[PDB]
């Protein structure tokens, strides 16, 4: 069959929200502290902090996210932030160079660059393999933003209070996605299942990042290089 | 008469400490977030945060500062930091341009630049007049570092516990300074009194900065642009 008017509206809301909160020019990157080849921590902390602001604004056009309590919104953002960032970064990832190409050579981040920001191959290896698998799925823009909104409105996050409601919005987004794939995506007959498994990958990426971030945020000579937003969001402040 | 061996040692310790913690090349400035013409807040926050690290290291070669309790050291640094920074910045201030010239044109800060970092002429006017008066005093390098060490080891700071001891080290530094002026500074017969009055100026500059910083640190869209070190040091965390 076809998609309802309500699902078309949700799709249009989501991609407009992604378009407003993601700059294909990457021109704001000149305002981060410049990269140096833990030499990359200042630049990459700025990059993530900037990305967190974007993710907050994207969240902010998700239909129904705002109508949740401010505590639920904070819970959802704090535990899903790094996953949305990992997800959205696939738009700059390129299989030809196996890295993220945002500007010229200064703003291209390969594995060795992230190494010099306090992270090991235990995170980098699954992360790059995640970007590779997700890029080969060749998602439509609608599926990409749908996946990000589904990932963020997960009710199985610590701290969420109104599970019922969040799971409800997450379910309606899953049905829009599942329907958009079966109608407008040729040969997507197993795609949705694979996307749902990408979410599970993000959970394992999340936990190893949360571990590695802890060890660096617990050393003041390193956590002094982070930003207030990063510390607030990635800290266990509760 | 002449200066004792002990006072020569103190002088040499102080200027070596200043030389190690102050870079006339200003070449680390490329690693701050770049200035933009509250557009200057990110660059100037980075500049101050970097300067705080330097001031800590300078403090760290002051003979006797380390032998104080770690709480006294924190008390002394938290309330004197912005004053030492105002003082040390006179080395880049130039009367010919009425601003601080550190790099090329990007790293020259005139009054309008600081305006766009959340500060009013109520602070900027006395600050620039302070830099002007202090630069026309044409201090020797020894007097400049002596003045900074005296300013930091002031026992009339909130939070200090061992007044006796800090006032003692402050007194010995004042007598070294007073003696160096009368022996090695031609026509300095009123200079020391004027330097002591510069300290009083710093107190009034300190308080108006503390007020203006409060109003900006209380707006999260602005305090998110500060650094962890700046927030820790300039906050009333106690």
């Amino acid at each position: 069959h076809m998609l309802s008017d309500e699902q078309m509206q949700i799709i249009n809301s989501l991609v407009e929200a992604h378009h407003k909160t993601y700059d294909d020019s990457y021109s704001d990157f000149v305002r981060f502290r410049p990269p140096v080849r833990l030499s990359m921590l200042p630049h990459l902390a700025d990059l993530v902090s900037y990305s967190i602001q974007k993710v907050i604004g994207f969240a902010k056009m998700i239909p129904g996210f705002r109508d949740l309590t401010a505590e639920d919104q904070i819970a959802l953002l704090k535990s899903s932030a790094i996953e949305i960032i990992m997800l959205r970064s696939n738009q700059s990832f390129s299989l030809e160079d196996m890295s993220w190409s945002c500007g010229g050579p200064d703003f291209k981040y390969c594995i060795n660059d992230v190494t010099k920001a306090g992270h090991t191959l235990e995170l980098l290896e699954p992360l790059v393999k995640f970007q590779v698998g997700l890029k080969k799925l060749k998602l439509h823009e609608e599926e990409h933003v749908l996946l990000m909104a589904i990932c963020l409105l997960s009710p199985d996050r610590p701290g969420v209070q109104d599970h019922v409601r969040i799971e409800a919005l997450q379910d309606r987004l899953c049905d829009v996605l599942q329907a958009y794939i079966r109608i407008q995506h040729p040969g997507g007959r197993l795609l949705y299942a694979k996307m749902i498994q990408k979410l599970a990958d993000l959970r394992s990426l999340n936990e190893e990042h949360s571990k590695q971030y802890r060890s660096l945020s617990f050393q003041p000579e390193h956590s002094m290089q982070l930003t207030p937003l990063v510390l607030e969001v990635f800290g266990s402040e509760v | 008469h002449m200066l004792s061996d002990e006072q020569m040692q103190i002088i040499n310790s102080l200027v070596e400490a200043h030389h190690k913690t102050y870079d006339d090349s200003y070449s680390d400035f490329v690693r701050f977030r770049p200035p933009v013409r509250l557009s200057m807040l990110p660059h100037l926050a980075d500049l101050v945060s970097y300067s705080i690290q330097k001031v800590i290291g300078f403090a760290k070669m002051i003979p006797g500062f380390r032998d104080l309790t770690a709480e006294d050291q924190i008390a002394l640094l938290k309330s004197s930091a912005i004053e030492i920074i105002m003082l040390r910045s006179n080395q880049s201030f130039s009367l010919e341009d009425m601003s601080w010239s550190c790099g090329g044109p990007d790293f020259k800060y005139c009054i309008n630049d600081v305006t766009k970092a959340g500060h009013t002429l109520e602070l900027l006017e006395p600050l620039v007049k302070f830099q002007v008066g202090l630069k026309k005093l044409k201090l020797h390098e020894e007097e400049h570092v002596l003045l900074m060490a005296i300013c930091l080891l002031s026992p009339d700071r909130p939070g200090v516990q061992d007044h006796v001891r800090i006032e003692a080290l402050q007194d010995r530094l004042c007598d070294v300074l007073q003696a160096y002026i009368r022996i090695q500074h031609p026509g300095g017969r009123l200079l020391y009194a004027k330097m002591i009055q510069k300290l009083a100026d710093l107190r009034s500059l300190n308080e108006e900065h503390s007020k203006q910083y409060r109003s900006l640190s209380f707006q999260p869209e602005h305090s998110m642009q500060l650094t962890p070190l700046v927030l820790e040091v300039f906050g009333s965390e106690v």
């Binding site: 602001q53 907050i56 604004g57 902010k60 401010a70 919104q73 904070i74 953002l77 704090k78 207030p228 937003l229 607030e232 969001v233 402040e237 509760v238 | 999260p220 869209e221 305090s223 998110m224």
Partner: peptide, 11 residues
Amino acid sequence: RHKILHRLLQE
């Protein structure tokens, strides 16, 4: 708690 997050979610 979460001074900046609150701020960025309002407006």
